[PDB]
C-alpha cells in the first residue's frame, strides 16, 4: 500500500466526497487494501503541526515514491495567502509553499478535479486570487514531476480510483520509471487518461437520434427529446458518464437535466451559460 498525501488547496471537498462514493472497490477497501492515506485533512486522526510533521516524516522515508493528490486550485496572488494549509512551529505553510516542497519528491502528482487540473471555478471570470492549475504551477516553478489530470466537477469515483489503480498496476509490472512512462502514454492532450475521457458524450448519447431528427425538449421534465436547446454541452464534452452513469448507476446529468461540460479545461466559463445553446 503506497503512501498517498492528499492536499486541499482552493477545493470544496467534493472531490474527496465523490471518492467516498466508490462502489467497487468500496472506499473501505481502497483505504485498507489499495493505498495508505497518510495525510488527508478531512478524515485523518491527528491534527495541526503534528499532522504536517507526520506527512513530512513519511515523505522523507518514501522520497521519490509517494503519490501526491491535489484537490482544488493553487492561488498565487498575495504571496500565496489566499490558501494557508497549515502551520509548523509558527511557520505558515501556503498551498504554494506546500506544492513547492512535496511536488519535487512525489512519484507522481494526481490533479483530481477540474479546479486542480485546469483551474476550474476558482480561476473563472471575476476571481482575483491567481488560482492556478497544478501542472502550470509546477511548470512555472521548474518542477518536472509527472502530473496526471483526473478532471470533472466532481470526477466520478471510478475515474479517480481507476486512474490510481491503473498507475499502481503499471508500476508493479514495469517498475517505477517504466510504470510512469506507461501512464503518460494513455493521457490525452489535456493530461486525462483515455480509458475514461477518450470518448465524446454526445456521440454515444441515447438521445442522439432525437438530436438528428431535430426533436428538442422545451422543458426539463420532457425526457423524450434531445436536451440541446436546454443547454446541453454533451457535443463538446469528453467523458463516459453515458455508460457508467452516476452514484451506483441511478442517474446521470443528461437524463436528469443537462451536461454542463464539467470535465473540460474551459469549465465553467467556456460552458456558460449552462441553460442555453
Amino acid at each position: 500500500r503506497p503512501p498517498v498525501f492528499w492536499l486541499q488547496g482552493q477545493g470544496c471537498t467534493g472531490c474527496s466526497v465523490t471518492l467516498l462514493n466508490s462502489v467497487h472497490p468500496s472506499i473501505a477497501d481502497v483505504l485498507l487494501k489499495v493505498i495508505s492515506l497518510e495525510f488527508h485533512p478531512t478524515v485523518m486522526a491527528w491534527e495541526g503541526e503534528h499532522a504536517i510533521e507526520h506527512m513530512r516524516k513519511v515523505a522523507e522515508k518514501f522520497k521519490g515514491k509517494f503519490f501526491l493528490v491535489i484537490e482544488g486550485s493553487v492561488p498565487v496572488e498575495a504571496d500565496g495567502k489566499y490558501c494557508i494549509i497549515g502551520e509548523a512551529n509558527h511557520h505558515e505553510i501556503s498551498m504554494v509553499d506546500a506544492l513547492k516542497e512535496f511536488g519535487p519528491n512525489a512519484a507522481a502528482v494526481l490533479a483530481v478535479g477540474t479546479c486542480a487540473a485546469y483551474g476550474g471555478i476558482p480561476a473563472a471570470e471575476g476571481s482575483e486570487t491567481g488560482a492556478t492549475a497544478v501542472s502550470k504551477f509546477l511548470g512555472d516553478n521548474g518542477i518536472k514531476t509527472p502530473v496526471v489530470n483526473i478532471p470533472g466537477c466532481p470526477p466520478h469515483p471510478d475515474w479517480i480510483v481507476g486512474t490510481v489503480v491503473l498507475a499502481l498496476d503499471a508500476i508493479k509490472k514495469n517498475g517505477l520509471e517504466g510504470g510512469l512512462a506507461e501512464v503518460v502514454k494513455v493521457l490525452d492532450s489535456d493530461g486525462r487518461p483515455t480509458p475514461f475521457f477518450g470518448r465524446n458524450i454526445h456521440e454515444n448519447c441515447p438521445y442522439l437520434d432525437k438530436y438528428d431528427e431535430g426533436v428538442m425538449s422545451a422543458t426539463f421534465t420532457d425526457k423524450v427529446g434531445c436536451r440541446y436547446d436546454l443547454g446541453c454541452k454533451g457535443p463538446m464534452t469528453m467523458a463516459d458518464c453515458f455508460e457508467r452513469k452516476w452514484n451506483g448507476g441511478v442517474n446521470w446529468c443528461v437524463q436528469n437535466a443537462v451536461c454542463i461540460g464539467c470535465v473540460e479545461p474551459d469549465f465553467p466559463d467556456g460552458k456558460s451559460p449552462f441553460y442555453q445553446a
Binding site: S36, E49, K81, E128, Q255, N256
Partner: protein, 481 residues
C-alpha cells in the same frame, strides 16, 4: 503561566481552519479562529446568466452543495417570479432531505467519532496524540469502529437517494429556478424508498443509540462549550405552496427568550477579517466583497455576521432548540436508562446541557431521526408523474432572497439582476455564523466564545480544543466562499 496553542490545520472538519487558544490553569481563556482559504464566489458570479448561479454556487462546498443549490433556486424563484409546482416542491425536499442524512452521518462517524473512538492501527487512523482520552470499553470501541465502517456504505446510499431525482451527487443537476428537472416515476420512487429504509434502520439502531451511549461515558462534555447560548433558525423545507409552514420554523433564541427572525437585522463586520475596511457593517442586500489579505489586525477570511448586534450559533442544536420537537423514542429511553433524565421534548435536556460540546452531537443525531419522519411523509405526499418544473424567462431587472437551513445551519443567498445578468450576489452561510472572528466591537464568534472554559489539563495533548470545534461541524469552504 499562559500557553498559546495554535492548531493548523484543524482536521476532521471541512475546509481550512486554524485555531489559536490561550490556556491558563488548565482552561482555555481566549480563542481566535482563522479561515485561511478564500475563493470569492460573490465576485465570480457577477456578470453571469442568473440561471448559472444554481450550478456555480454548489461548488462552494461538495459536502453541502444541495444546501446552496436550494438557497440559490429559492432566490431565483423570487427574482424570476416563478411559481414552483406542488410536486416540484416535494421533489426538492426529497433531493435535499436525503443529503441531511448523508451529512450528519458523515459528520458523526467519519469526522467526529475518532474524537472518542480508537481506529485500527493503520493510516489514516494513526498516528495521533499519545494521550487521546479515549474512554470506551473494548466492546463499545469496537461498535464505534464497526459502525464507522458500516456508515461508509450508508452515507454512499444517501447520495444514491439524492441522485435519483437530483442527477448526481456531489453537485446536483436537478434543482433549477422554477422547480425540479425530473418528474419522479413510480419505479424510481420505489428505489428511493428501498434505500431510505436501509438508512432509517441504521439511524434508529446504530447512530442515535451510539451517540447517547458514547455521551454517557463523557458526561463531563455536557458541562462545557456553552458560549453565548444564543441561536438562529431562518426556516427550511416548505410544507406547502404559500411559504408559511416549514419543517423547521424560523426563530431567534437569546438570553432565555424566543423572538421572531427579521432578516433586516443581519450585518456583516470585517474589522478582523481580510476585507476592505470601507465594507464593514453591511446588510447582505448591500453586501460587498473586497478582499484585503494584507490588512493589519485581521485574522480570517470569514466575515463576522451579527443579528441585531448579537453573536449567534446555528445548526442542528439551534434548529432543535428553537423548534423544540419531541425527542426520538430511543433518545427518551437512553436518557432515562443512562442519564437518569426524564425528557419528552428537546428543551427538556435543559439549556446548559443542550448548549454544550456533547449536546451538539446529540442534537445532530436527534435531528437525523427527525428528518426520517419528514422524508417518510414526503414519500407519501409526492405524486408520480405530476409536473415539477416551470420554465420562466430571465428578468431584465429583479432581486430575490433564498432562505434555507443547511445541515450545518442557517443559509441565505441574495441575488440582484441588472441587464439580465448577476449584478450582485451575497451569501450568508451556516459556518459563517459559527466560525467567524471578532466583530468590530470585539465580540467573539460563536465557536470562539464556546471555546472559553474548555479543559486542557495536558498542553502536550490538548485534545478538547478541536473536540469542541468539531461538535459544531465546521465547514470553512462555506464560511468563506
Amino acid at each position: 503561566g499562559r500557553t498559546t496553542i495554535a492548531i493548523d490545520p484543524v482536521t476532521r472538519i471541512e475546509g481550512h481552519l486554524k485555531a489559536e487558544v490561550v490556556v491558563e490553569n488548565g482552561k482555555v481563556v481566549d480563542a481566535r479562529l482563522s479561515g485561511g482559504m478564500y475563493r470569492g464566489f460573490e465576485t465570480i458570479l457577477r456578470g453571469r446568466d442568473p440561471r448559472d448561479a444554481s450550478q456555480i454556487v454548489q461548488r462552494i462546498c461538495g459536502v453541502c452543495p444541495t444546501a446552496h443549490s436550494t438557497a440559490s433556486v429559492l432566490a431565483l424563484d423570487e427574482a424570476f417570479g416563478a411559481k414552483v409546482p406542488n410536486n416540484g416542491r416535494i421533489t426538492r425536499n426529497l433531493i435535499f432531505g436525503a443529503n441531511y442524512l448523508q451529512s450528519h452521518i458523515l459528520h458523526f462517524y467519519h469526522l467526529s467519532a475518532q474524537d472518542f473512538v480508537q481506529g485500527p492501527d493503520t493510516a489514516p487512523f494513526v498516528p495521533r496524540f499519545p494521550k487521546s482520552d479515549l474512554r470506551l470499553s473494548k466492546e463499545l470501541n469496537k461498535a464505534g469502529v464497526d459502525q464507522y465502517i458500516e456508515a461508509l456504505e450508508v452515507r454512499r446510499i444517501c447520495h444514491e437517494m439524492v441522485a435519483l431525482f437530483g442527477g448526481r451527487m456531489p453537485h446536483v443537476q436537478g434543482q433549477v429556478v422554477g422547480g425540479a428537472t425530473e418528474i419522479p416515476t413510480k419505479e424510481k420512487l420505489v428505489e428511493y424508498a428501498a434505500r431510505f429504509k436501509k438508512v432509517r434502520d441504521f439511524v434508529e439502531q446504530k447512530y442515535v443509540p451510539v451517540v447517547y451511549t458514547i455521551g454517557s461515558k463523557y458526561k463531563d462534555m455536557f458541562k462545557v462549550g456553552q458560549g453565548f447560548k444564543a441561536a438562529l433558525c431562518v426556516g427550511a423545507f416548505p410544507l406547502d405552496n404559500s411559504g408559511k409552514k416549514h419543517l423547521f420554523m424560523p426563530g431567534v433564541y437569546a438570553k432565555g427568550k424566543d423572538m421572531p427572525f427579521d432578516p433586516s437585522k443581519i450585518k456583516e463586520y470585517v474589522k478582523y477579517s481580510w476585507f476592505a475596511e470601507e465594507t464593514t457593517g453591511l446588510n447582505y442586500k448591500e453586501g460587498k466583497t473586497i478582499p484585503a489579505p494584507d490588512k493589519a489586525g485581521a485574522y480570517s477570511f470569514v466575515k463576522a455576521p451579527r443579528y441585531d448586534g448579537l453573536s449567534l450559533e446555528v445548526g442542528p442544536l439551534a434548529r432543535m432548540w428553537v423548534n423544540n420537537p419531541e425527542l426520538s423514542p430511543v433518545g427518551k429511553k437512553l436518557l432515562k436508562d443512562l442519564f437518569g433524565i426524564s425528557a419528552k421534548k428537546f428543551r427538556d435536556l435543559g439549556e446548559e446541557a443542550a448548549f454544550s460540546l456533547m449536546g451538539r452531537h446529540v442534537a445532530r443525531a436527534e435531528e437525523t431521526y427527525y428528518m426520517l419522519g419528514a422524508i417518510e411523509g414526503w414519500l407519501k405526499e409526492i405524486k408520480a408523474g405530476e409536473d415539477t418544473v416551470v420554465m420562466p424567462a430571465v428578468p431584465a431587472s429583479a432581486e430575490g432572497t433564498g432562505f434555507t437551513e443547511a445541515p450545518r445551519g442557517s443559509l441565505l443567498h441574495y441575488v440582484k439582476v441588472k441587464d439580465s445578468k448577476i449584478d450582485n450576489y451575497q451569501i450568508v452561510s451556516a459556518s459563517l455564523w459559527n466560525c467567524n472572528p471578532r466583530d468590530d466591537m470585539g465580540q467573539r464568534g460563536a465557536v470562539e466564545e464556546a471555546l472559553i472554559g474548555i479543559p486542557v489539563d495536558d498542553i502536550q495533548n490538548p485534545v478538547n480544543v478541536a473536540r469542541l470545534i468539531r461538535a459544531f461541524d465546521p465547514x470553512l469552504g462555506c464560511a468563506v466562499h
